[PDB]
């Protein structure tokens, strides 16, 4: 797919309009090998946005940018980092995103072992996002601690939709090997037909991150880890002694090989473990420390 064909594809799906007339008060806050990020203000609402300005001539895996724009433009949820607009601006794609300042969950969970109230607070938020996305037929496919972003006031939001997919009556299952090795569901690794259940497995691995500090098999090569995950009974907590019977049960609903037996996001929202959910404030001191 040439640069010219990709622009043509994007032209069909992006918002109309030219953000060079619509935004102001730009401040460069980031840069990468394929673009920059600027904070800016939307003129009539005053809203602050983070504008990813992607040089499509340098960008690779351009199909992922297309898929995220096409899929996520029409979904919104309080626990999902919102994509307000996307625009084709000459040779670049500008994507206007909700701006958050509390870092990523990994910043904290790499350093500290969350208590069960904190774990419940995080899981309840991610599960509200997933229950909404799954009901829409969206599969995230890259759930892991660093896909979870936080606000300074302790709100928990899901981000990093690069690998997302949309299922439909017509195409009800995916079979692509996508995601991040240590968090991939066994059926993804085996390239079986799969649907929204894979995000629940990944969430289970994230719970292990929260309790233990790292996912299973983390010292193995990513290829070796995938082989063990593909073949083996589900991985267990290293710190199993730490965890309440109710949290053990919650985790055991997630890390289930048989995707039909595995819990759905809605089942997990209804689980007694989430009776332990705290106020956003329960994360705020940690977010400030890390
Ligand atoms: Cl924030």
Author numbering: 385 to 674
Quote the study's own text.
PAKs are serine/threonine protein kinases that are regulated by Rho GTPases of the Cdc42 and Rac families (Knaus et al., 1995; Manser et al., 1994; Martin et al., 1995). In humans, the PAK family comprises six members, which are classified into groups I (PAK1, -2, and -3) and II (PAK4, -5, and -6) based on their domain architecture and regulatory properties (Bokoch, 2003; Jaffer and Chernoff, 2002; Kumar et al., 2006; Zhao and Manser, 2005). Group II PAKs (PAK4–6) regulate a wide variety of cellular functions, and PAK deregulation has been linked to tumor development. Comparison of five high-resolution crystal structures comprising the kinase domains of all three monophosphorylated, enzymatically active group II PAK family members revealed a number of catalytically productive and nonproductive conformers presumably representing snapshots of catalytic domain movements during catalysis.
Finally, we solved the structure of noncatalytically productive apo structures of PAK4, PAK5, and PAK6. The activation loop residues important for autoactivation (Ser474 in PAK4, Ser602 in PAK5, and Ser560 in PAK6) were completely phosphorylated in all structures determined, and the presence of a stoichiometric phosphate moiety was confirmed by ESI-MS (data not shown). Studies on cellular stress-response pathways suggested that PAK5 and PAK6 are linked to this signaling cascade by an activating phosphorylation on the consensus MAP kinase kinase 6 (MKK6) site (Thr-Pro-Tyr) in the activation loop (Kaur et al., 2005; Maroni et al., 2000). The structures of group II PAKs showed that this consensus motif is embedded in a deep cleft and is not accessible. In addition, PAK6 has been reported to be responsible for regulation of androgen receptor signaling in prostate cancer (Schrantz et al., 2004; Wang et al., 2005).
